[PDB]
Design an enzyme around this catalytic site. Structure first.
Site, PDB file in Angstrom:
ATOM      1  N   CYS A   1       1.174  -1.022  -0.367  1.00 56.20           N
ATOM      2  CA  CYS A   1      -0.256   0.358  -0.264  1.00 56.20           C
ATOM      3  C   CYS A   1       1.021   1.674   0.043  1.00 56.20           C
ATOM      4  O   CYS A   1       1.794   1.540   0.717  1.00 56.20           O
ATOM      5  CB  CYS A   1      -0.989  -0.053   1.227  1.00 56.20           C
TER       6      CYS A   1
ATOM      7  N   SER B   1       0.652   3.819   1.743  1.00 57.12           N
ATOM      8  CA  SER B   1       0.899   4.501   2.957  1.00 57.12           C
ATOM      9  C   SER B   1       2.666   3.315   3.771  1.00 57.12           C
ATOM     10  O   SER B   1       3.915   4.411   4.568  1.00 57.12           O
ATOM     11  CB  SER B   1       0.019   3.428   4.207  1.00 57.12           C
TER      12      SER B   1
ATOM     13  N   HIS C   1       5.382   5.892   1.596  1.00 60.52           N
ATOM     14  CA  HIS C   1       5.124   7.240   1.820  1.00 60.52           C
ATOM     15  C   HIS C   1       6.424   6.863   2.751  1.00 60.52           C
ATOM     16  O   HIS C   1       7.172   7.702   2.390  1.00 60.52           O
ATOM     17  CB  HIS C   1       3.818   7.352   2.213  1.00 60.52           C
TER      18      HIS C   1
ATOM     19  N   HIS D   1       1.514  -3.229   6.885  1.00 56.05           N
ATOM     20  CA  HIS D   1       0.349  -2.924   8.013  1.00 56.05           C
ATOM     21  C   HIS D   1      -1.551  -3.442   7.038  1.00 56.05           C
ATOM     22  O   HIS D   1      -2.364  -3.413   7.984  1.00 56.05           O
ATOM     23  CB  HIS D   1      -0.046  -1.182   7.695  1.00 56.05           C
TER      24      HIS D   1
ATOM     25  N   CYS E   1      -6.402  -2.659   5.081  1.00 52.26           N
ATOM     26  CA  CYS E   1      -6.433  -1.220   4.788  1.00 52.26           C
ATOM     27  C   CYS E   1      -6.948  -1.561   3.782  1.00 52.26           C
ATOM     28  O   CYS E   1      -8.376  -0.340   3.635  1.00 52.26           O
ATOM     29  CB  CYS E   1      -5.045  -0.730   4.208  1.00 52.26           C
TER      30      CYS E   1
HETATM   31  N1  LIG Z   1      -2.861   3.190  -1.991  1.00 51.29           N
HETATM   32  C1  LIG Z   1      -3.626   2.407  -1.360  1.00 51.29           C
HETATM   33  O1  LIG Z   1      -4.589   1.071  -1.523  1.00 51.29           O
HETATM   34  C2  LIG Z   1      -4.299   3.677  -0.628  1.00 51.29           C
HETATM   35  C3  LIG Z   1      -5.710   3.229   0.651  1.00 51.29           C
HETATM   36  C4  LIG Z   1      -6.897   3.742   1.283  1.00 51.29           C
HETATM   37  C5  LIG Z   1      -6.662   4.969   0.949  1.00 51.29           C
HETATM   38  C6  LIG Z   1      -5.724   5.738  -0.519  1.00 51.29           C
HETATM   39  C7  LIG Z   1      -5.625   7.135  -0.614  1.00 51.29           C
HETATM   40  O2  LIG Z   1      -6.578   7.044  -2.080  1.00 51.29           O
HETATM   41  C8  LIG Z   1      -5.260   7.214  -2.670  1.00 51.29           C
HETATM   42  C9  LIG Z   1      -4.940   6.912  -3.944  1.00 51.29           C
HETATM   43  O3  LIG Z   1      -4.472   5.575  -3.571  1.00 51.29           O
HETATM   44  P1  LIG Z   1      -5.770   3.763  -4.026  1.00 51.29           P
HETATM   45  O4  LIG Z   1      -7.045   5.454  -4.557  1.00 51.29           O
HETATM   46  O5  LIG Z   1      -5.791   3.342  -3.809  1.00 51.29           O
HETATM   47  O6  LIG Z   1      -4.882   4.488  -6.031  1.00 51.29           O
HETATM   48  P2  LIG Z   1      -3.820   5.220  -6.577  1.00 51.29           P
HETATM   49  O7  LIG Z   1      -3.223   6.353  -5.962  1.00 51.29           O
HETATM   50  O8  LIG Z   1      -3.286   4.659  -8.064  1.00 51.29           O
HETATM   51  O9  LIG Z   1      -4.770   5.755  -7.485  1.00 51.29           O
HETATM   52  C10 LIG Z   1      -5.200   7.548  -7.360  1.00 51.29           C
HETATM   53  C11 LIG Z   1      -6.404   7.012  -8.654  1.00 51.29           C
HETATM   54  O10 LIG Z   1      -7.022   8.734  -8.707  1.00 51.29           O
HETATM   55  C12 LIG Z   1      -6.644   8.809  -9.845  1.00 51.29           C
HETATM   56  N2  LIG Z   1      -6.576  10.452 -10.499  1.00 51.29           N
HETATM   57  C13 LIG Z   1      -5.228  11.229 -10.307  1.00 51.29           C
HETATM   58  N3  LIG Z   1      -5.380  12.902 -10.919  1.00 51.29           N
HETATM   59  C14 LIG Z   1      -6.716  12.780 -10.602  1.00 51.29           C
HETATM   60  C15 LIG Z   1      -7.890  13.461 -10.837  1.00 51.29           C
HETATM   61  N4  LIG Z   1      -6.710  14.964 -11.315  1.00 51.29           N
HETATM   62  N5  LIG Z   1      -9.136  13.374 -10.489  1.00 51.29           N
HETATM   63  C16 LIG Z   1      -9.182  12.050 -10.711  1.00 51.29           C
HETATM   64  N6  LIG Z   1      -8.713  11.446 -11.089  1.00 51.29           N
HETATM   65  C17 LIG Z   1      -7.144  11.030 -10.737  1.00 51.29           C
HETATM   66  C18 LIG Z   1      -5.305   8.229 -10.975  1.00 51.29           C
HETATM   67  O11 LIG Z   1      -5.461   8.021 -12.210  1.00 51.29           O
HETATM   68  C19 LIG Z   1      -5.578   7.194  -9.285  1.00 51.29           C
HETATM   69  O12 LIG Z   1      -6.565   6.212 -10.583  1.00 51.29           O
HETATM   70  C20 LIG Z   1      -4.310   7.328  -1.546  1.00 51.29           C
HETATM   71  O13 LIG Z   1      -3.182   8.382  -2.823  1.00 51.29           O
HETATM   72  C21 LIG Z   1      -4.204   7.228  -0.826  1.00 51.29           C
HETATM   73  O14 LIG Z   1      -4.172   9.124  -0.286  1.00 51.29           O
HETATM   74  N7  LIG Z   1      -5.426   4.994  -0.911  1.00 51.29           N
HETATM   75 ZN   LIG Z   2      -2.310   1.348   4.227  1.00 51.40          ZN
END
Ligand SMILES: NC(=O)c1cccc([C@@H]2O[C@H](COP(=O)([O-])OP(=O)(O)OC[C@H]3O[C@@H](n4cnc5c(N)ncnc54)[C@H](O)[C@@H]3O)[C@@H](O)[C@H]2O)[nH+]1
Ligand SMILES: [Zn+2]
Ligand SMILES: NC(=O)c1cccc([C@@H]2O[C@H](COP(=O)([O-])OP(=O)(O)OC[C@H]3O[C@@H](n4cnc5c(N)ncnc54)[C@H](O)[C@@H]3O)[C@@H](O)[C@H]2O)[nH+]1
Ligand SMILES: [Zn+2]
Ligand SMILES: [Zn+2]
Ligand SMILES: [Zn+2]
Lengths: 374, 374
Positions: A46, A48, A51, A67, A174
């Site tokens: 993930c 996180s 990061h 995690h 998560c």
């Molecule tokens: N990485 C994880 O498993 C996870 C878990 C929990 C929460 C999150 C939240 O979700 C966020 C992204 O991680 P994720 O969703 O799991 O996957 P990710 O980081 O691959 O997804 C982000 C998505 O948003 C898209 N994107 C980027 N810019 C834009 C924009 N301008 N407008 C619309 N869409 C856009 C991008 O193409 C991707 O599909 C992460 O940064 C965190 O803030 N992520």
């Molecule tokens: Zn996580």
């Protein structure tokens, strides 16, 4: 054959930020009162965790991250009542001590005994159950799942279903729950509503799955990448909208489409610009926008308070607002009940040795969820 | 003796922004289908009316402002079923057509048929029931209470108690209900909780009264002016804190005091700096901060999204989230039931002729609520 003794196993150790992981021979000290030493079967990768490498999420180095994972309980320290060895369990990076303001509150989940606000990278007692060649290695969020063996406090562990496919239920540690919960626990999507989801990553597909569990009839997935439209649709989105297709701003087009703004808007990207937009497009008089996640290095988003006056709720949350210990078992059981599926999110499974390899996939480009197996 | 005919009466006309009002001889055309022409008995003076003068709240000029008032229904146009002449009523600047998304929603109150978002300063039909020496004078929020006679649509009017002391229940048209509702309808304060109120104006004392109706055991009033501590306490605040007394930031001291941040925080000032602070001091894992009001000329507040991730709800609202038509009668009845009192807020009553005089009091310095009487 292991119980009560210091185990020597392999784990990804981050000796310094911006460095690949080192598969290290580590020692995993036995568990004390209220600690449980788990045998990792599977752990997901993930953002996180990534990061930490970058410095973005400041936590003690060296460290064994991880995690999101599920495994088998090997030994249980003293007083441990919630589990017995053999137990399929999922480490919980957001605890549930069931004794603080937050656990006692009927709503909050962000347990006070967490290690996120002011990371220590230790167990509750201030110590560490890890050592590499005599040198102590830090814990991460009281879980450290990038290790073949880990020791988590009893408040950071949950007993799940003995039939749980651990290569798939780990998502509930998560990723899935963070999304699914945003829709089903935080925003609280309602039968009939129209949701809009910004970002279609794994956390996004999970939010879409939540909205579906809720009954939202319209689930608009928005992403600048057309290639994310299939999964999302397949997963539940009734239609996706790529913002680069239009000449007008998206929130404009989400309002036109929704005739007045969506019921609930979710932002699963992490941008500050998109955070405001996700708010700007839900019904002004009763729309709820949920920030599913934020970069831990984030800065001040500029926003005009008028947006809230209309009657717009803005909510944030950690772990889909679920009360980890109470919730995880139930999320599992549900999956086990053949409700939601976790497969469409697991786009890659790599042997734990390929950890640094799983990250490159995460880092550069799409890999919904990479599950590292032990 | 008036019914069905154009009445010639006095009213404060704002011919141009940043000009005092002119007590004008105006003509009040009879009411058409679904309009109700009211006889103002009392109208209060509120910041929102003053915004119009300044330009801050852009609405058509010339205009007859006023939106917080209660009076007697003189004639009722066609189809008017909700009232009959003789009726004590309160104009509602936030309608309740009971037919749009918002009225149909079980929560939202911000009626679509409002004239706040895109002011027209007219009745529903696009016309005006006002004229001064032949020239048409604009309506304000479909109420225009700074006139001895006014015509409001049926959706912008509410029948109240025949025993209603109109010099005191007028507060329920904006001021009281905007505050009281923030606590009892929007934030939804709970038995036992600890609230913190930023700003102790009339809207503040109303929020404090709401929290009290709710059961909050601790109600911390915060204001840079020591002179506002008595009323507030007298009104309900269990303790007030003047931010200029400390060396540390207030949210710090509100958290220390509350041991972890208050349950609900209310901002009844309008500052952008204080808006963020009010958020920053409620429980990070389940605190709800409510922006009771915002200057209509406001700009972008800078805020770090981390604040919401913890699990902090941020809500805004119009008219204490009350569904005007449904609510006003009940707020009245309650007052009439000897629950809350409205006196401590009415710090001045001035003959309507002294309108421009009531504003100077508002504008420069403290005057909780000035009630202009007819
Ligand atoms: N990485 C994880 O498993 C996870 C878990 C929990 C929460 C999150 C939240 O979700 C966020 C992204 O991680 P994720 O969703 O799991 O996957 P990710 O980081 O691959 O997804 C982000 C998505 O948003 C898209 N994107 C980027 N810019 C834009 C924009 N301008 N407008 C619309 N869409 C856009 C991008 O193409 C991707 O599909 C992460 O940064 C965190 O803030 N992520
Ligand atoms: Zn996580
Ligand atoms: N004027 C109204 O009747 C009314 C009605 C509904 C909503 C509101 C909201 O309430 C806002 C203020 O009007 P009001 O509350 O009725 O009365 P007001 O404008 O007199 O009250 C504002 C109060 O906040 C105080 N204050 C100013 N700066 C600070 C600060 N830095 N920290 C703490 N306290 C401070 C100030 O002393 C005053 O007591 C108004 O601007 C609007 O946003 N006002
Ligand atoms: Zn706890
Ligand atoms: Zn007002
Ligand atoms: Zn309506």
């Amino acid at each position: 054959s292991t119980a009560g003794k210091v185990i020597k196993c392999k784990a990804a150790v981050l000796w310094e930020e911006k460095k690949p992981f080192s598969i290290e021979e580590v020692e995993v000290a036995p568990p004390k009162a209220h600690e449980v030493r788990i045998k990792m079967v599977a752990t997901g990768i993930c953002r996180s965790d990534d990061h930490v490498v970058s410095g973005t999420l400041v936590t003690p180095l060296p460290v064994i991250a991880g995690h999101e994972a599920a495994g088998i309980v090997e030994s249980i320290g003293e007083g441990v009542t919630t589990v017995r060895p053999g137990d399929k369990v999922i480490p919980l990076w957001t605890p549930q001590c069931g004794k603080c303001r937050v656990c006692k509150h009927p709503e909050g989940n962000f347990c006070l005994k967490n290690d996120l606000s002011m990371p220590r990278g230790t167990m509750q007692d201030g110590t560490s159950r890890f050592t590499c060649r005599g040198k102590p290695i830090h814990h991460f969020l009281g879980t450290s799942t990038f290790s073949q063996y880990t020791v988590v406090d009893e408040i950071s562990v949950a007993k799940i279903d003995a039939a749980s496919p651990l290569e798939k239920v780990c998502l509930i540690g998560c990723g899935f729950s963070t999304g699914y919960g945003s829709a089903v626990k935080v925003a609280k999507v309602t039968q009939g509503s129209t949701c809009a989801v910004f970002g279609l990553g794994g956390a996004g597909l999970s939010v879409i799955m939540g909205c579906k569990a809720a009954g939202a009839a319209r689930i608009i997935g928005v992403d600048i990448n057309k290639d994310k439209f299939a999964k999302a649709k397949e997963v539940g989105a009734t239609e996706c909208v790529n913002p680069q297709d239009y000449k007008k701003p998206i929130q404009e087009v989400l309002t036109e489409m929704s005739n007045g703004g969506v019921d609930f808007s979710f932002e699963v990207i992490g941008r500050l610009d998109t955070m405001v937009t996700a708010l700007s497009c839900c019904q002004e008089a009763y729309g709820v926008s949920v920030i599913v996640g934020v970069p831990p290095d984030s800065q001040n988003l500029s926003m005009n308070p008028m947006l809230l006056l209309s009657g717009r709720t803005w909510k944030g949350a950690i772990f889909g607002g679920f009360k980890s210990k109470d919730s995880v078992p139930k999320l599992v059981a549900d999956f086990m009940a053949k409700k939601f599926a976790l497969d469409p999110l697991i786009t890659h499974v790599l042997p734990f040795e390929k950890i640094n390899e799983g990250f490159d996939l995460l880092r550069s480009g799409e890999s919904i969820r990479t599950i590292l197996t032990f």
